[PDB]
């Protein structure tokens, strides 16, 4: 990204698919949007899909939310 790494920040729409990583999330509310999940190490981990009721946002790039792989390949520095 232009300044280095990027925070995804995608705000989910109601019904949008989201993913947590049971291995890497610091807590079960840490999630990823579909693009970040598919473009991340967590696609090969023990993930758990949850449908959003809307609002809340992707935690990709939050360097304190993930025990491994805090950035997908799109958002990494
Ligand atoms: Zn994202
Ligand atoms: Zn990302
Ligand atoms: Zn993971």
UniProtKB/Swiss-Prot annotation:
Tissues where the protein occurs: Broadly expressed, with highest levels in skeletal muscle, kidney and pancreas. Present in acinar cells of the pancreas (at protein level).
Subcellular location: Cytoplasm, Cytosol
Zinc finger regions, UBR-type: 6-77
Annotated positions binding Zn(2+) 2: 8, 21, 24, 33, 36, 42, 45, 58
Entry binding sites for Zn(2+) 1: 8, 33, 36, 58, 60, 72
Residue numbers binding a peptide: 57, 59, 62
Sequence positions that bind Zn(2+) 3: 21, 24, 36, 42, 45, 60, 72, 75
Domain-related comment: The RING-H2 zinc finger is an atypical RING finger with a His ligand in place of the fourth Cys of the classical motif. The UBR-type zinc finger forms a pocket that mediates recognition of type 1 N-degrons. It exhibits preference for arginine in the first position. It binds N-degrons with a methylated arginine in the first position.
Disease connection: Johanson-Blizzard syndrome: This disorder includes congenital exocrine pancreatic insufficiency, multiple malformations such as nasal wing aplasia, and intellectual disability. Pancreas of individuals with JBS do not express UBR1 and show intrauterine-onset destructive pancreatitis.
Family designation: Belongs to the E3 ubiquitin-protein ligase UBR1-like family.
Complexes and interactors: Interacts with RECQL4.
Protein's job: E3 ubiquitin-protein ligase which is a component of the N-end rule pathway. Recognizes and binds proteins bearing specific N-terminal residues that are destabilizing according to the N-end rule, leading to their ubiquitination and subsequent degradation. Recognizes both type-1 and type-2 N-degrons, containing positively charged amino acids (Arg, Lys and His) and bulky and hydrophobic amino acids, respectively. Does not ubiquitinate proteins that are acetylated at the N-terminus. In contrast, it strongly binds methylated N-degrons.
Protein name: E3 ubiquitin-protein ligase UBR1
Organism: Homo sapiens (Human)
Section covered of the full-length record: 97 to 168 of 1749
